[PDB]
Amino acid sequence: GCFVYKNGATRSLLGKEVVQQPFYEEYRKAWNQINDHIADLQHRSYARTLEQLVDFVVGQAEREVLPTAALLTGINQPDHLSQFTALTQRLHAQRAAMVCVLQSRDCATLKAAVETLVFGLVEDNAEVERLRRSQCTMKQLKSWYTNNFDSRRQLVVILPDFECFNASVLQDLILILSAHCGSLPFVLVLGVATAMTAVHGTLPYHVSSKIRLRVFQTQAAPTGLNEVLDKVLLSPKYAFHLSGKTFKFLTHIFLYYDFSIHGFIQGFKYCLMEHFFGGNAFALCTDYSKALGRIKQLTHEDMETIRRLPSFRPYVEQIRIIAVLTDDDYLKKKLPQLLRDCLLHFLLFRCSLEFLTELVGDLPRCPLGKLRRELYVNCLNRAIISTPEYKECLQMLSFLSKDEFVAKVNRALERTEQFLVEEIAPLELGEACTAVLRPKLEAIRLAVDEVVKAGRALQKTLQLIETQIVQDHLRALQDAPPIHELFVFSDIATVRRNIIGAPRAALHTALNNPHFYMQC
């Protein structure tokens, strides 16, 4: 039933030509950037719960029922395996404990569970500082513990997938671990997926009589998605922005289907791959100096497919062109100004989004939504001023009393200026961004001084905020500056048909009309 084609196996499939292309280098760099940023955000999110868990294990270590701490994690286990790995990293760094991770696949029976537990503890101590798994008795674990650490490390036993266990196997495991307490200091962290009522319902009297569990709560998955979207994919310093259709489709997959951050990262990775694998013309998309080096590197097929992108067409239509449409070298000389135009437009887009998100999400009823992501998808899908919801927002903002209105504009002013100092200032090509945005902010500040010293002037201040921030710095994607296709990824149809899977729909269209596919 199976055939082997072994070719030199003992005891990066692409060659040098593809890796030496600029797009693989820039794609690997941008992907490494996004991946390291997501890992940094997850560690800064987990550090508090990590400190609480380490304080519980060390406090049990300072001092029969086994102490045990349930960790009420989310529906989807695999995101939290890295969290448990960080717990093992901290417990090894402090010399406070050693960890065995009992997956549900290892415990079909009590025997296999005891063998993988003892084997994981012994090899875990071997890797902090190969006998057969058949002889890893609990008595040998006791003799090895007396041989070592009596001269105290806790023996933490993570059970990440608590619901996937057989109930009788779990109860037998709890009784075996409780029988050896006193001699072996056990902490039994768990990874419950439902609620504490599932734990109390699957565990009867005799197993829960010897449990002194304490509940900890990991942060919510939508809270993690909102933090990741506000601090990584909407960061000004990254030049690759998603389109609003792709953004809404990925957030729709996360909020409406599965609470996996990893599936959202893989869908964004497939989006980044379909963007970057069209050629070196998509290798133009990064930071300004290496981009100028890329323009000095460019060949000709990239020039033809940078002529081929749809947003290039209004730029030529609004116009010399002979030297643009066929002379190549004049377009190579022309490229840095257009690239500087796109990067400046997206930085102004982020600062105007920060201002408008404060000014609209503080409002009651919120027609335009609260978070930056919802405003972001709405202003990129379509023009924001023409929406009826923005008209309702303008009505409720001119309806306000003067005091709450000046307080809201002053909060938006201090928020946008603090964002310009703390976040825009370190980036290169950022001095031009504050030089463009700040005089308009000063004009709005003079309008604030006019409405403090003086009802109708509140309408003049709203008109100035509309025509000086929303109108010029928050345009629709059709009105985006040219070759923004280098920076956005709007093709959601192919990513949707390659990620979302509907075998029954494909079988249905294959059994109704073959002519749709075969073209008979």
């Binding site: 002529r307 081929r308 067409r313 239509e317 116009i319 010399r320 062109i321 002979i322 449409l325």
Partner: peptide, 17 residues
């Protein structure tokens, strides 16, 4: 419209500009 007919008409308007 196709990109090719647009590029061809633009190249003709370009040599004519």
């Amino acid at each position: 419209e196709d990109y090719e007919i647009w590029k061809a008409r633009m190249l003709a308007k370009a040599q004519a500009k």
